[PDB]
């Protein structure tokens, strides 16, 4: 689908913004292992230190 086909509004608001960011789910093991470890260190307290 087009980027204006996924928005639930007109395409003029997209031109109205200064910087748009299309944020992805990369859907692979090498990234979500790192994300899972980051969140576990957040919950543990290592990331605070």
């Amino acid at each position: 689908k087009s980027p204006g086909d996924n928005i639930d509004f007109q395409t003029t608001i997209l031109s109205r913004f200064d910087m748009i960011f299309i944020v992805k789910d990369d859907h692979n093991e090498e990234r979500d292992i790192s994300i899972a470890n980051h969140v576990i260190n957040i919950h543990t307290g290592n990331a605070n230190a």
Binding site: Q10, T11, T12, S15, R16
Partner: protein, 637 residues
Amino acid sequence: PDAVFGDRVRRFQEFLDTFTSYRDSVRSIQVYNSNNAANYNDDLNILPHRIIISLDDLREFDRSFWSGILVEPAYFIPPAEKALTDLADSMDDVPRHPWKLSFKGSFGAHALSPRTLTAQHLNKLVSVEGIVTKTSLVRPKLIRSVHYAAKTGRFHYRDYTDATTTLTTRIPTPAIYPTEDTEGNKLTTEYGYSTFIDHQRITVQEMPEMAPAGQLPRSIDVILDDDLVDKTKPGDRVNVVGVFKSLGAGGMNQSNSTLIGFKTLILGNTVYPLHARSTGVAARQMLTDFDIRNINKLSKKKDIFDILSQSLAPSIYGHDHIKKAILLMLMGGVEKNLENGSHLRGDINILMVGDPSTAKSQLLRFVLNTASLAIATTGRGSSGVGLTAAVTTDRETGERRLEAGAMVLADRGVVCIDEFDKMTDVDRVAIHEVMEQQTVTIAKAGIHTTLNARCSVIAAANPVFGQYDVNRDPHQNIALPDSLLSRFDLLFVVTDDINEIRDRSISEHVLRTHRYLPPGYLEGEPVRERLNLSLAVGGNYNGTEIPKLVTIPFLRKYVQYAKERVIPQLTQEAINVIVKNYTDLRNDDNTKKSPITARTLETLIRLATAHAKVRLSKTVNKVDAKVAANLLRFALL
């Protein structure tokens, strides 16, 4: 008699003898009254007996007396008023109401707000800026009553005073209304010989532009006397100069026993209706003789239409025909009032539809900034009662009153509508009457009245598909009823067509536009925003007094002089051109964005008349008709 009172009277005599501007202002008021009285005697208006006093000149003359007026006005203002009255009576012997005073200038710490006013400013002369929310009915107040005794055939009188009419508190002596003389005879009230002074109460609230965004607003009460009534309407931004005074006893007597506190209000001395953006006060600028000569020097040039148009928004590249249309809208045509009561429009209405990010909103904001009485509205934000009128209930009288919407408040002005295509249907039906009959007819439960809504409407709209398609016909592109298009005199379709050299011109213009500093500003210093309030009386940056491009402040004066002075009339050489082009446009085979109805014909007339205001010509010539015709043709083709 008081010695310090006489000393201050003499000091104000010296101050008035030093500055002769107040003296010949008194002279000009008295001779105006005398010539009006003489014209009434032989074959009208009477100027009030008050003089505007500059506080800066008084500070330059006497610091002590200036600080006395600012800090202790009850001890210093009445000597100054008596001095002005004596000066007026000194020169009035050759050709009775005592003269009042008003103040302008810098007030320092006394330039306050309804929120900022506290009890430390009591018994002091304050200048409070704000917005008028409530305006009481102008009520006459009896000062002296005159009575007749028929048995003895004699006229008596009694004077009445209150704590409001005086700055210095005296003993309250309540003299009852005499219905019987000292001998016991009945008195008849002689209305017409008694004197009544107009009294008004207004409520000044802090401006919503300078108020905290979530808190409840603070308000003050201002009392106005005869010459100062009816100078304000609700919704105006105002500057009130007056003495902040407390009255009565705050429950400290036995009869009162409550915590209203001491009642606090302002005895108004000066009322200045300030012009603010998207408000009901029209901006007025004083036209000096030099500026009039400059305007007449512009009017003689052949290129005059293309300098005033190109000098509108030099920071917007292109859109030159839209600049011409906006200038002609600012001129505003001539309104015809026929002898049988039928009415013909003079105002020019502009609609712009087209691609996003094409200087539509910026042009609307420019018209909001540069017009005298422009009011900004958006599509969904204001409704059918929001633009036209609504009904509310009075607290005092108990009867319903009216509240004026955007069209009524912007009478003899401009309504700047953004997102025109997002109006509701009932709002559109409200717009239909305003754009042609120039009036708002409201028939509510018990209220039936017509309000004057003589407005020029400039509107920005978007196509229904978000972008204009060249191959598709404009009927589905604009997708607006043909009555609405017939209301609009000029419809402009702005297309964001992509060309390399055009895009380079856009980039160079914008990048040179983003490299500006105001004079007196450093390279890295950020620009400060000051709110624009102007007193209402009655890509080249270096534009200073018509080098090549006209300044916006001088454009305003040119527009004001043209609207006030010249009322052009048609002649046959323009009529022939207008008739021929209207006949050609009605019977042309070319497809056009807007349908050609009868309105277009008057559009031509108005446009031609508008160009005659640009040249300051009492006559509408052939060249005016031709420039109206080819401005219409570009918008249509």
